[PDB]
């Protein structure tokens, strides 16, 4: 999904709000902040109502201005609440009743997702690969900056996971794939307009093709 969450390479932001080794304060800065993650795990591990991938996607589905104005942990309160409503576990009415006011949720998905591709290639360390020049409206773990770009395999995972584009929509056809650490030259991604050296993106096999 080409949403505002795909931030890598966006220009115009100011300074990162940190200097090295500065105090970051407590883990949680408010008494509710542990709730989104803990309730995410209740949903995933206790209820089996959704996957972690579905949590990433429901946060991506926040209305774009809403996403941009909402602090991190609050996005996950909204996302988890949205999934609970979409899965028929809670209603928005009861959430708003208990909250004592408006509790707007993420927008509905505009894609049913896609299955893990049947045709993929097993790559080896040192091989040159291209990121498939594809556009996916639902969940995908490919940041746009690497779409259609060419890099070199530096690692093939020794484990396999469900394809995010499927499991992120709760589909039954996510299969399992290894991922690959693909190293790109900075200039391959941003031309002359970068000060870096290389960027390594951890890409599912189904996002890749021989170069």
């Amino acid at each position: 999904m080409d949403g505002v969450h795909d931030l890598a390479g966006v220009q115009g932001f100011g300074k990162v709000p940190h200097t090295v080794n500065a105090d970051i304060g407590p883990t949680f800065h408010a008494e509710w902040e542990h709730l989104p993650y803990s309730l995410m795990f209740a949903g995933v591990a206790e209820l089996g109502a959704f996957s972690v991938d579905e949590v990433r996607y429901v946060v991506e589905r926040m209305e774009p201005r809403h996403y941009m104005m909402t602090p991190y942990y609050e996005r996950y309160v909204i996302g988890v609440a949205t999934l609970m409503v979409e899965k028929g576990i809670l209603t928005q009415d009861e959430l708003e009743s208990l909250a004592g006011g408006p509790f707007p949720l993420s927008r509905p998905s505009e894609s049913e997702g896609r299955p893990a591709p049947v045709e993929t290639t097993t790559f080896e360390v040192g091989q040159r690969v291209r990121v498939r020049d594809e556009y996916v409206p639902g969940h995908i773990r490919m940041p746009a900056y690497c779409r259609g770009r060419v890099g070199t395999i530096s690692h093939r995972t020794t484990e396999k996971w469900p394809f995010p584009d499927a499991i992120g929509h709760g589909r039954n056809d996510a299969g399992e794939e290894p991922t690959y650490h693909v190293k790109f030259a900075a200039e391959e991604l941003f031309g002359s307009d970068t000060d870096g050296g290389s960027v390594v993106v951890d890409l599912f096999e189904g996002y890749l093709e021989p170069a």
Binding site: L7, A8, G9, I24, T27, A99, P143, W161, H181, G197
Partner: protein, 191 residues
Amino acid sequence: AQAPVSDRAWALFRALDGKGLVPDGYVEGWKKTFEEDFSPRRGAELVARAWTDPEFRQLLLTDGTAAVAQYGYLGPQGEYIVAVEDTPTLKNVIVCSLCSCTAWPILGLPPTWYKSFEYRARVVREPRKVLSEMGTEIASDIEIRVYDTTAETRYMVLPQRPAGTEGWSQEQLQEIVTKDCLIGVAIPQVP
């Protein structure tokens, strides 16, 4: 228009708890894990061991998962670990440009700054300027490599061991390996 976030967060808890969907002590148990168990002190222990034990260093860099498992530090958002080695000509830095993905059990939960749109947007494209602004100068004769945490690999940086620490105990070395050293935005300093 929105109700206060605290009210919305507790409403979500109460709605689920009131339907019997949240086990007793569940969120409290997670809070304890997040606050007390997940910690960059664990990553620091791994780094200090690698610095003083060439055999463990080799394991950590070839099978990070196995090395971390030896200490019992695998966990949620830290089940497949890859350690990335700084060298005299290479500085590694970690980000999750798409959200906040972090090796929780060994780095601790990500700090606000790491989750910021500023870091997520900028470090992939201008890591030298970002690190400089944060107080870490990386010379031009050094390659910067940014790892974008886009799938299930969870990363830690193995920084270079600074001169002046020769002979230090693992405990002494652990003290100079900070959360920011593990993420890659800081270089360990001799106090």
